[PDB]
Amino acid sequence: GKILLLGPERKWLRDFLESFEDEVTQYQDKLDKKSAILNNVDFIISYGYRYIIHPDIVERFKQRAINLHISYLPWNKGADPNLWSFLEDSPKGVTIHYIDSGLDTGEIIVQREVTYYENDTLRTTYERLTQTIEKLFMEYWPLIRLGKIRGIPQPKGGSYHKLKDKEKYLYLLTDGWDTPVQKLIGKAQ
């Protein structure tokens, strides 16, 4: 079996994927649709990939491409989900879903709600989301890779944001990552 990991290199994740006796390739740059990196690839996992996957790849790898996203879909599709979950006071959590045409709208494989606490900052909620999704992926990948599970359709609704939407709220982030989230709740309504 051949796994393509899209996003930054992560040693724990390579060793995890490779312990299934799968061969694992990793790529973090924009991926040309006709690139030979895709030759013989059985499964694509994106996690922190900074580029949009070209639609022809997406179509070619229907039910063979998943994404690890740190929101509770359908809320906070797209950019900066952790910040927007507090600015818009939305559900908080992480989701593994199949990759779709369009921006984080494919079928939901499993999700998990993540709680926050009164002293939390953007930093401590983001790290908690990261630990949660990485554990969740280790729990469910054995089933995902053997086609043992499949997705339910992702509900329309929720919310979506672009990287630039946060610009008008940056003034609230007086400590950057260390801004307490309590200050931010509901500031975008």
Tokens found for residue 165? 């939407």
Q: What is d(CA 27, CA 8) in angstroms, rounded to the nearest whole number? A: 7
Residue 54 falls in the annotated catalytic set: no
* Cis peptide bond upstream of 155, omega within 30: no
Determine contact, residues 77/159, Cβ cutoff 8 Å: yes
Rounding to the nearest 10 degrees, give the CA dihedral for residues 142, 144, 146, 151.
150
Determine contact, residues 25/5, Cβ cutoff 8 Å: yes
CB atoms near residue 17 (< 10 Å): 23
Q: What is d(CA 184, CA 121) in angstroms, rounded to the nearest whole number? A: 10
* Cis peptide bond upstream of 74, omega within 30: yes
Q: Enumerate the domain spans of the chain.
A: 1-189
Tokens found for residue 151? 């997705």
Resolution in A: 2.0
Q: What is d(CA 167, CA 170) in angstroms, rounded to the nearest whole number? A: 5
Amino acid residing at 136: L
| Experimental determination technique | X-ray
Tokens found for residue 39? 């030759």
Tell me which of 54, 69, 97, 161 is the catalytic residue: 69
Q: Which helix (H) or strand (E) holds 87?
A: helix 81-87
